[PDB]
Design an enzyme around this catalytic site. Structure first.
Site, mmCIF file in Angstrom:
data_model
loop_
_atom_site.group_PDB
_atom_site.id
_atom_site.type_symbol
_atom_site.label_atom_id
_atom_site.label_comp_id
_atom_site.label_asym_id
_atom_site.label_seq_id
_atom_site.Cartn_x
_atom_site.Cartn_y
_atom_site.Cartn_z
ATOM 1 C CB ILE A 63 -1.091 -0.003 1.098
ATOM 2 C CG1 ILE A 63 -2.214 -1.195 1.041
ATOM 3 C CG2 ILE A 63 -1.697 1.242 1.559
ATOM 4 C CD1 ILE A 63 -2.659 -1.708 2.024
ATOM 5 C CD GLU A 243 5.096 -7.772 16.824
ATOM 6 O OE1 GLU A 243 5.640 -6.923 17.372
ATOM 7 O OE2 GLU A 243 5.634 -8.124 15.829
HETATM 8 C C1 LIG Z 1 9.304 -2.822 16.128
HETATM 9 C C2 LIG Z 1 9.643 -1.456 15.037
HETATM 10 O O1 LIG Z 1 10.179 -0.476 15.228
HETATM 11 N N1 LIG Z 1 8.448 -1.231 14.178
HETATM 12 C C3 LIG Z 1 8.627 -0.100 13.195
HETATM 13 C C4 LIG Z 1 8.285 -0.499 11.786
HETATM 14 O O2 LIG Z 1 7.088 -1.431 12.034
HETATM 15 P P1 LIG Z 1 6.605 -2.699 10.984
HETATM 16 O O3 LIG Z 1 7.763 -2.795 10.145
HETATM 17 O O4 LIG Z 1 5.861 -3.562 11.618
HETATM 18 O O5 LIG Z 1 5.676 -1.666 9.992
HETATM 19 P P2 LIG Z 1 5.266 -1.728 8.526
HETATM 20 O O6 LIG Z 1 5.599 -0.428 7.860
HETATM 21 O O7 LIG Z 1 6.532 -2.722 7.854
HETATM 22 O O8 LIG Z 1 3.835 -2.328 8.116
HETATM 23 C C5 LIG Z 1 3.675 -3.785 8.326
HETATM 24 C C6 LIG Z 1 3.198 -4.124 6.713
HETATM 25 O O9 LIG Z 1 2.102 -3.328 6.304
HETATM 26 C C7 LIG Z 1 2.107 -2.970 4.995
HETATM 27 N N2 LIG Z 1 2.216 -1.396 4.925
HETATM 28 C C8 LIG Z 1 2.407 -0.700 5.718
HETATM 29 C C9 LIG Z 1 2.220 0.758 5.636
HETATM 30 C C10 LIG Z 1 2.256 1.042 4.301
HETATM 31 O O10 LIG Z 1 2.233 2.547 4.032
HETATM 32 N N3 LIG Z 1 2.211 0.433 3.030
HETATM 33 C C11 LIG Z 1 2.124 -0.879 3.508
HETATM 34 O O11 LIG Z 1 1.823 -1.660 2.486
HETATM 35 C C12 LIG Z 1 3.601 -3.726 4.312
HETATM 36 O O12 LIG Z 1 2.848 -4.934 3.861
HETATM 37 C C13 LIG Z 1 4.310 -3.726 5.532
HETATM 38 O O13 LIG Z 1 5.378 -4.457 5.392
HETATM 39 O O14 LIG Z 1 8.097 0.374 10.958
HETATM 40 C C14 LIG Z 1 7.175 1.445 11.377
HETATM 41 C C15 LIG Z 1 7.026 2.381 9.966
HETATM 42 O O15 LIG Z 1 7.518 1.785 8.776
HETATM 43 C C16 LIG Z 1 7.513 1.962 12.578
HETATM 44 O O16 LIG Z 1 8.761 2.531 12.538
HETATM 45 C C17 LIG Z 1 7.520 0.906 13.628
HETATM 46 O O17 LIG Z 1 7.961 1.500 14.996
#
Ligand SMILES: CC(=O)N[C@H]1[C@@H](OP(=O)(O)OP(=O)(O)OC[C@H]2O[C@@H](n3ccc(=O)[nH]c3=O)[C@H](O)[C@@H]2O)O[C@H](CO)[C@H](O)[C@@H]1O
Ligand SMILES: CC(=O)N[C@H]1[C@@H](OP(=O)(O)OP(=O)(O)OC[C@H]2O[C@@H](n3ccc(=O)[nH]c3=O)[C@H](O)[C@@H]2O)O[C@H](CO)[C@H](O)[C@@H]1O
Lengths: 285, 285
Positions: A63, A243
């Protein structure tokens, strides 16, 4: 369904008086395997699952700017994810024309499912539970046997195969597999549906890699979504979002397999410890 | 069926970097748990199975002089077998008036099923597969969730509980758990349905203790009976009778749990090795 006989196979005899790992826990206290390299003979498992004509669905959300991650994600899935088995990729995106043209092996197909983009990353991440649950109603029950639900900002670097498949699985978060439960970043506010007390908890599961049968994934994702909606009505957002809820769910509904952090790793942050014989699914730096 | 949430429970946290046994193999190469003491938290398992209202059937044959074994068998089953859960004992005998009056705990019942007595002990032993399969048609599907099928000339000396329950299980024969596969006493004549080549085999399973869901037990016992009938038409009897056929079945249809020899032991012949932390189900000398 009815399972035919395995063919004759020649392989090393299991050794009853030799542990398969001397450095790690390979079974949970509720008798779920913890999947590490050296715990499984992939030849035997591939036979079992091929004889059942198993189809694996792989859901991924790309996204807004995260569409950039799809090319590597899908290219590396083609090299390492369930090779030899039927695979259906389900790419959920707000930009259905921006999915890269990745060449797929035989028996592998891809569907693009258009969804809305939420403004906050927290909401994009959390609303995956609703979106997965909604799609379990239609597509997934008729098209696949198992669903695997992963983050997109990742790449496969080694085998991820039918060893993971089971009614319900979670994956050990790579930041906490050696931590004591008090240090786990569960939601600790009793006002939230995701609340876990300081004296409870088996593992800290990563929100980036879970799955199971379509039935069990429908249950998990529905429960997490309904819990999020209760929290939202009460003006609270769980500390680690989807999570947190996933962790509450898997505490009270124990997974039938647990994946080691081989399956969810970040080499930039954590290197390559001796305990990891293979780094299978890893963060893109 | 739909499974409700576990209640809050306080217990020791699983230790990811500590093996639960350093002296034995606790998972098969096809990711089936091998059930030893120290691999399971019985509090968690008892909750899971009680929340499903699980009923366990226990089949035992007491034909001709083997009626003498029933009193101790049933008395010790009352002390150690699935205590807290619903149990239905099915005693198959040619002497339905000679079953001892054993006092049963609440939620536990006993049915006596009259069967014919064959002349040779080999046939009595082998025909259990037919008799079990026949009874899976009627009684067992409507009355139980799992069936456990054991020899009668045995006693329970320690806990045998829901840790064993799974779609299909076999038990490691106590005479061969440390042996190499060439030394396993599989049927080695290609003319028999039970034939296993010298280079194949995972374990040598004991014919005295197997079980599973009613569906899986129906399959196993039917297959073994049909195989015996083919052998009989060809003028051959497998070297170790029902155990030979059971071994052929479990080679080509892998069990979903394997029980350690804690669950099938003979202390007279084998003593009490360090590797056995508990002797649960044992031969009567
Ligand atoms: C433990 C930790 O430090 N976690 C960080 C990390 O979480 P996360 O790595 O858990 O968040 P993320 O942004 O990777 O979201 C999880 C998943 O949702 C989807 N997705 C999310 C957002 C978006 O705009 N588009 C989309 O497609 C995508 O499949 C992504 O891999 O990253 C976040 C922003 O990136 C924040 O910095 C969080 O603090
Ligand atoms: C490995 C080994 O050395 N096996 C011996 C042992 O096999 P087994 O101990 O395998 O034979 P078994 O006689 O215990 O038969 C298996 C089971 O069938 C039932 N059953 C059998 C016969 C009978 O007249 N009534 C009856 O009820 C009973 O539940 C019994 O426990 O004993 C046999 C005679 O006992 C032979 O000496 C076998 O060589």
């Amino acid at each position: 369904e009815f399972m035919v006989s395995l063919p004759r196979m020649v392989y090393p005899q299991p050794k009853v008086l030799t542990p398969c790992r001397k450095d790690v826990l390979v079974v949970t206290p509720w008798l779920a395997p913890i999947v590490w390299e050296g715990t499984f003979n992939i030849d035997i498992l591939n036979e079992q699952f091929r004889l059942q004509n198993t189809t694996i669905g792989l859901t991924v959300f790309a996204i807004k700017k995260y569409v950039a991650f799809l090319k590597l994600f899908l290219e590396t899935a083609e090299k390492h994810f369930m090779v030899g088995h039927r695979v259906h990729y389900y790419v959920f995106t707000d930009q259905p024309a921006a999915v890269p043209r990745v060449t797929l092996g035989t028996g592998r197909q891809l569907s693009v499912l258009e969804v809305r983009a939420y403004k906050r990353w927290q909401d994009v991440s959390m609303r995956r539970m609703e979106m997965i649950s909604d799609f379990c109603e239609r597509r997934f029950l008729s098209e696949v046997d198992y669903l695997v639900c992963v983050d997109v900002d990742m790449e496969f670097r080694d085998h991820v195969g039918v060893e993971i498949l089971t009614p319900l699985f979670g994956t050990l978060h790579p930041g906490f597999y050696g931590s004591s439960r008090e240090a786990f970043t569960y939601e600790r506010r009793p006002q939230s549906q995701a609340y876990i007390p300081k004296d409870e908890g088996d593992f800290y599961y990563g929100g980036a890699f879970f799955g199971g049968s379509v039935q069990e994934v429908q249950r998990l994702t529905r429960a997490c979504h309904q819990a999020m909606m209760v929290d939202q009505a009460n003006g609270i957002e769980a500390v680690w979002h989807d999570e947190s809820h996933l962790n509450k769910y898997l505490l009270r509904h124990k997974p039938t397999k647990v994946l080691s952090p081989e399956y969810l790793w970040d080499q930039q942050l954590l290197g390559w410890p001796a305990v990891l014989r293979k780094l299978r699914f890893t963060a893109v730096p």
